[PDB]
Structure formats: structure tokens, C-alpha cells
Amino acid sequence: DSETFSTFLLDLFKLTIGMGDLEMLSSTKYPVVFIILLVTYIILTFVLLLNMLIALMGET
Amino acid sequence: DSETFSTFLLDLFKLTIGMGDLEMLSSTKYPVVFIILLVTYIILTFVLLLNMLIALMGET
Ligand SMILES: CC(C)CCC[C@@H](C)[C@H]1CC[C@H]2[C@@H]3CC=C4C[C@@H](OC(=O)CCC(=O)O)CC[C@]4(C)[C@H]3CC[C@]12C
Ligand SMILES: CC(C)CCC[C@@H](C)[C@H]1CC[C@H]2[C@@H]3CC=C4C[C@@H](OC(=O)CCC(=O)O)CC[C@]4(C)[C@H]3CC[C@]12C
């Protein structure tokens, strides 16, 4: 399923930029857990990982 | 009205992400107060709550 992964990765990175739509989830079973996982992914990427990068510069 | 709440919550969280549109307000009376409330919600979520999280890491 290399092609599916290749397409989805571009879509996921675009969603990470803040632009796009998660229309691909129609084929997924148990959509709730996918929503939760994407929620936590966004939270980690934006709140914790990005903030720590901010903090490091200030202290150095 | 559990179903309406379930749908609206997803829409509201999506708006919190910065993507989506607030098309659901057509059925609402006194739209102005709804606009104001969403304004203050966004202000608190982005300006004050998010900033305090930034500040805490720097001081620790
Ligand atoms: C966060 C940092 C540390 C990681 C760097 C991110 C890259 C690994 C991501 C960002 C955008 C991604 C790319 C988005 C689009 C494509 C084209 C894709 O091949 C295609 O041309 C089919 C899809 C298309 O044509 O758009 C193969 C993966 C690639 C290079 C993706 C692979 C991984 C990339 C470079
Ligand atoms: C800011 C932090 C501390 C709170 C965490 C946010 C979650 C409580 C929000 C974010 C996205 C929300 C979800 C968006 C979509 C859905 C599916 C929804 O049920 C449906 O499948 C119908 C709507 C649809 O299929 O899209 C029930 C609520 C849920 C899990 C929402 C409930 C609450 C969630 C998980």
C-alpha cells in the first residue's frame, strides 16, 4: 500500500500546516480513535514540541 | 438534542484549529451575541490560555 501512504503523507503534512481537509477518513472503521489520535498529534506538534523550541532559544 | 451537540462540538473544535466555517449559525436568534461569545472564546483560547502555557516553561 505504498501509494496510499504516499498520498496520505502529503495530506497529513498539509493538515500539519493548517490548510486542507481530512476527507480521507471515510474508509476508516472506528473513526473516533482516529479523531483522538489526530487530536493528540496536533497537540504534541503545536503545544509541546513547538513550545520547547521557543523556550530553548530564550534560555540560551 | 444530543446529536446536534455532537455535530456542533466537532465543528467548534475544527474552528478552534483555525480551519472550517461557522455556517451553522443560520438558525440562531440574536446572532450578534453569538458572534461576541465566539470572539471572546477565541481570544481566551489563543491569547491568554495559550500564552500562559508559554510563560510557564520559560520561568521554570
Ligand atoms: C518535520 C520534519 C522533521 C520532516 C520533514 C517532512 C517531509 C519528510 C515531508 C513533508 C512533505 C512530504 C512530501 C509530500 C509529497 C510528496 C510526493 C510523493 O510522491 C508523489 O509525487 C505523489 C503525490 C503527489 O504528486 O503530490 C512522495 C512523498 C513526498 C516527497 C512527501 C514525502 C515526505 C515530505 C517531504
Ligand atoms: C482542549 C482539550 C483540553 C479538550 C479536548 C478536545 C476534545 C474533547 C474534542 C476535540 C474534537 C472533538 C470530537 C470531534 C468529533 C467527534 C465525533 C462525534 O460523533 C460522530 O461521529 C458524529 C460527528 C462525525 O462523525 O464527525 C462525537 C464527538 C467527537 C468525538 C468530538 C468530541 C470532543 C472532541 C474529541
Side-chain angles (χ1 to χ4, degrees), chain A residues 2 4-14 16-21 23-26 28-60, chain B residues 2 4-14 16-21 23-26 28-60:
Chain A
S2 298
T4 67
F5 179 82
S6 63
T7 62
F8 176 98
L9 182 58
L10 172 56
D11 182 299
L12 180 66
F13 184 78
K14 205 173 296 190
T16 303
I17 304 171
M19 51 179 299
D21 186 1
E23 181 62 8
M24 191 63 180
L25 62 74
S26 64
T28 283
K29 322 297 285 298
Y30 266 57
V32 296
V33 68
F34 209 145
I35 300 164
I36 300 171
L37 284 181
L38 296 171
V39 162
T40 40
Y41 187 14
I42 286 177
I43 292 163
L44 281 178
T45 51
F46 198 106
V47 157
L48 291 180
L49 296 176
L50 178 63
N51 179 338
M52 268 296 181
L53 179 64
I54 294 169
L56 181 56
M57 171 52 202
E59 293 298 341
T60 51
Chain B
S2 298
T4 67
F5 179 82
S6 63
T7 62
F8 176 98
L9 182 58
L10 172 56
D11 182 299
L12 180 66
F13 184 78
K14 205 173 296 190
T16 303
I17 304 171
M19 51 179 299
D21 186 1
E23 181 62 8
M24 191 63 180
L25 62 74
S26 64
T28 283
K29 322 297 285 298
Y30 266 57
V32 296
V33 68
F34 209 145
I35 300 164
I36 300 171
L37 284 181
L38 296 171
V39 162
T40 40
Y41 187 14
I42 286 177
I43 292 163
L44 281 178
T45 51
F46 198 106
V47 157
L48 291 180
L49 296 177
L50 178 64
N51 179 338
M52 268 296 181
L53 179 64
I54 294 169
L56 181 56
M57 171 52 202
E59 293 298 341
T60 50

